[PDB]
Design a binder for this molecule. Structure first.
Ligand SMILES: COCCOCCOCCOc1ccc(C(C)(C)CC(C)(C)C)cc1
Lengths: 140, 487, 50, 123
């Protein structure tokens, strides 16, 4: 989905043109249901149903690195994880601009192949140390 | 065949409602009433049906002295605008009625204003580069054909001279005309911009002009100003499709294109979503931008000035505009006061086509190296003012020389102002420019002094200036030596 | 550097709160206008149906 | 009484954030920076792992009993444990687990010095 933040603007048009009572950030209030109908249809189905899947990587636009926006938190309140790209790093050459601190995957540990699970453990510890050792010195 | 007639039924400001006795015309359809009644011609476009026979229509002029239940003529279509060679060197309002007093316009056909956007098939996914001729732009900020560009400039930063030069270069390089769109333009600047196009011969009245002008002024209601950019862009789609060529589309501040539509949505009664911008913000803005695209048949590029209210990028009008832009030609008064013209600040600028998947590899690596260089020069500039140049190593002071050379080399003259200031202008190509910066980057042109790169174009052109400087200083020495030796 | 880091957040929250205050005032006014529309009645619409 | 004093200490640490964020810890009185070095310890100690979040912290979860929760804060409040560094309190439960972790960090940190000595002598 590229992207949901622009879907909400269209639904906002439809509501406001119908004079439905607005809410926070101009939105009606049933804008949460709008995305929950959509992202709950993603699932790893049961063996009773075929063990299929529907993975959903929605995209959402922030403003000046602000996860306190209404839509961003509506969707973090729905999704099974989070990937946070920072413009500070994208401008600073690092591309993809993932911030590992503000990023998380709530479920993928079970799915991560063991070959990658162990390497990920090592690098998670390493970056937990790098994140601290890079800031504590502050050029001291 | 006959023509349809309707009757007014209410007037509230710019808004007007029109009863009919038959099927109501389509939406955005223009409705004219003769000039004998109001005293002047009057057009209103349908926006919003209210019943099977009523049609709310926004009015583009003043509806003063308009009685009730007056006859109202259905044009049969929406606002048909002029198109063609005859459009050039002229000014047109929203309806295509020329306001420059310069007689009629001898056009053959007259196209509607709300043309649907190009289909996906008409598009060309291949991202191309517009050879602007301005090395500062071409190196760091390649204007992508069929793309949207940002221009950030107040007063006294060479904004006018830039857009004038763009018109000239695209008229000769790509063989393509241009078009200007003054949305909410101060009516003083219309004169100060139409007369600069006489001294620069961008509008040669006794010859071949290059740009069309479209002024929707502040003295006009928002129903007009909102429908301006569609007019100036309809002028450009003729040159894209029929003439089969590339086009520029200059847009005085898009902020004032957004505000006007906000006002229309207010008058219609639509609930303002956010800070006060219409709920249809991205729709009304995107219906415009999506027509500004490349094609199999041509291209329309759009250099768009953007006002940022309160210097806040998070406001929906800038934020929605930025989602459509491709490059940002920032202008600064600082570099302008430092002698640089065009007054571009390359580091705070940015582009989207800067990717070797789009452009050739050399153009990319050279530009990224210049960005590295000038960034390092900014840091060392923060050190020199504190410590001193003698504090720096031998490796650092070399790039402190070359970065100064680069920044002075960005300074380019303009054929537009060739009469005003006297100096010639230089249309420098793309590939030649990359070899020039690659020479200045690989150090193979370091013996040349700094000031030789000031206000020149092309490495092949500065060397004449370097020789001129050396010859001049040698003549001053030969003058001083013999003036002192004679006595 | 630190003071600037604070200044951007202050400018950011200042403008955030500014815009939210604007939106809120609008919705107050629209709430009142809408409530009055509910207060106003519908007419009769008497006309020949036959 | 312990909780009242913990909350009080953090109420002071919060007021000093407005300075530390601006100037630095080096511009604070000795008393003040001791409160800083202690409130940071309390805040890091408040953290602990849960059996549910083992996937994330990568640690087994502890179950801190109530009576063992107060003596630890009281020791950390009366200055009974200030030689311990700040990071030994991060993501543990019970001061016994701290002293184990502090031993781990001291061992690893010293081993880096003997290791760097051999890396320097061989170099
Ligand atoms: C990776 O390629 C990116 C290319 O992006 C092209 C479109 O860029 C959109 C421009 O975004 C900005 C961002 C910030 C600004 C600033 C904050 C510098 C403007 C200012 C100082 C006037 C408020 C201007 C434009």
């Amino acid at each position: 989905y590229d992207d949901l933040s622009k879907q909400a603007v269209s639904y906002r048009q439809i509501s406001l043109l119908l004079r439905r009572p607005p809410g926070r950030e101009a939105y009606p209030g049933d804008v949460f249901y709008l995305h929950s109908r959509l992202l709950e249809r993603s699932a790893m189905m049961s063996p009773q149903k075929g063990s299929g899947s529907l993975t959903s990587l929605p995209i959402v636009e922030t403003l000046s690195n602000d996860v306190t926006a209404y839509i961003v938190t509506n969707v973090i309140s729905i999704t099974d994880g989070q990937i946070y790209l920072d413009a500070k790093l994208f401008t600073g050459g690092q591309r993809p601009a993932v911030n590992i601190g503000l990023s998380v995957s709530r479920v993928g540990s079970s799915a991560q192949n063991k070959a990658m699970k162990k390497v990920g453990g090592a690098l998670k510890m390493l970056m937990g140390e790098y994140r601290k050792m890079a800031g504590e010195q502050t050029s001291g | 065949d006959v023509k349809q007639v309707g009757y007014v039924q209410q007037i509230i400001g710019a808004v007007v409602d029109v009863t009919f006795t038959d099927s109501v015309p389509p939406v955005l359809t223009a409705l004219t009433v003769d000039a004998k009644e109001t005293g002047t011609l009057l057009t209103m476009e349908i926006v919003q049906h209210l019943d099977t026979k009523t049609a709310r229509c926004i009015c583009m002029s003043s509806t003063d002295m308009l009685r009730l239940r007056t006859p109202v003529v259905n044009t049969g279509s929406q606002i048909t605008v002029p198109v063609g060679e005859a459009t050039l060197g002229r000014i047109f309002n929203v309806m295509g009625d020329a306001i420059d007093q310069r007689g009629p316009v001898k056009n053959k056909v007259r196209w509607p204003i709300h043309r649907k956007a190009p289909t996906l098939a008409e598009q060309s996914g291949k991202d191309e580069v517009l050879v602007t001729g301005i090395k500062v732009i071409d190196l760091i900020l390649p204007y992508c054909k069929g793309g949207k560009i940002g221009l950030f400039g107040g007063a006294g930063v060479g904004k006018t001279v830039i857009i004038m030069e763009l018109i000239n270069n695209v008229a000769k390089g790509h063989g393509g005309y241009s078009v200007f769109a003054g949305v909410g333009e101060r009516t003083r600047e219309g004169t100060d911009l139409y007369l600069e196009m006489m001294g620069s011969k961008v509008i040669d009245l006794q010859g071949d002009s290059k740009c069309v002008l479209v002024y929707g002024q502040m003295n006009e209601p928002p129903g007009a100003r909102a429908r301006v950019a569609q007019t100036a862009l309809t002028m450009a789609e003729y040159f894209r499709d029929e003439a089969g060529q590339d086009v520029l589309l200059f847009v005085d501040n898009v902020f004032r294109f957004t505000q006007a539509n906000s006002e229309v949505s207010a008058l219609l009664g639509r609930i303002p979503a956010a800070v006060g911008y219409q709920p249809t913000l991205a729709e009304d803005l995107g219906m415009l931008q999506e027509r500004i695209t490349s094609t199999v048949k041509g291209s329309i590029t759009s250099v768009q000035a953007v006002y940022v209210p309160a210097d806040d990028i998070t406001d929906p009008a800038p934020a929605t505009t930025f989602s459509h832009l491709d490059a940002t030609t920032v202008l600064s008064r600082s570099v302008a006061e430092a002698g640089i013209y065009p007054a571009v600040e390359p580091l705070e600028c940015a582009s989207r086509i800067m990717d070797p998947d789009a452009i050739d590899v050399n153009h990319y690596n050279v530009a990224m190296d210049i960005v590295e260089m000038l960034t390092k020069y900014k840091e060392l500039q923060d050190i020199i003012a504190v410590l001193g140049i003698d504090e720096l190593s031998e490796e650092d002071k070399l790039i402190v020389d070359r970065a100064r050379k680069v920044a002075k080399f960005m300074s380019q003259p303009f054929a537009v102002a060739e009469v005003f200031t006297g100096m010639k202008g230089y249309y420098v190509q793309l590939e030649d420019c990359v070899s020039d910066f690659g020479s200045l980057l690989m150090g193979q042109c370091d013996n040349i002094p700094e000031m030789a790169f000031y206000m020149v174009g092309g490495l092949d052109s500065v060397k004449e200036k370097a020789a001129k400087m050396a010859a001049e200083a040698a003549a001053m020495r030969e003058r001083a030596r013999k003036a002192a030796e004679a006595k | 550097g630190n003071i600037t880091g604070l200044m951007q957040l202050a400018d950011y929250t200042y403008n955030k709160t500014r815009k939210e205050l604007i939106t809120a005032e609008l919705l107050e006014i629209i709430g009142t206008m809408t409530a009055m529309h509910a207060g106003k009645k519908v007419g009769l619409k008497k006309t020949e149906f036959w």
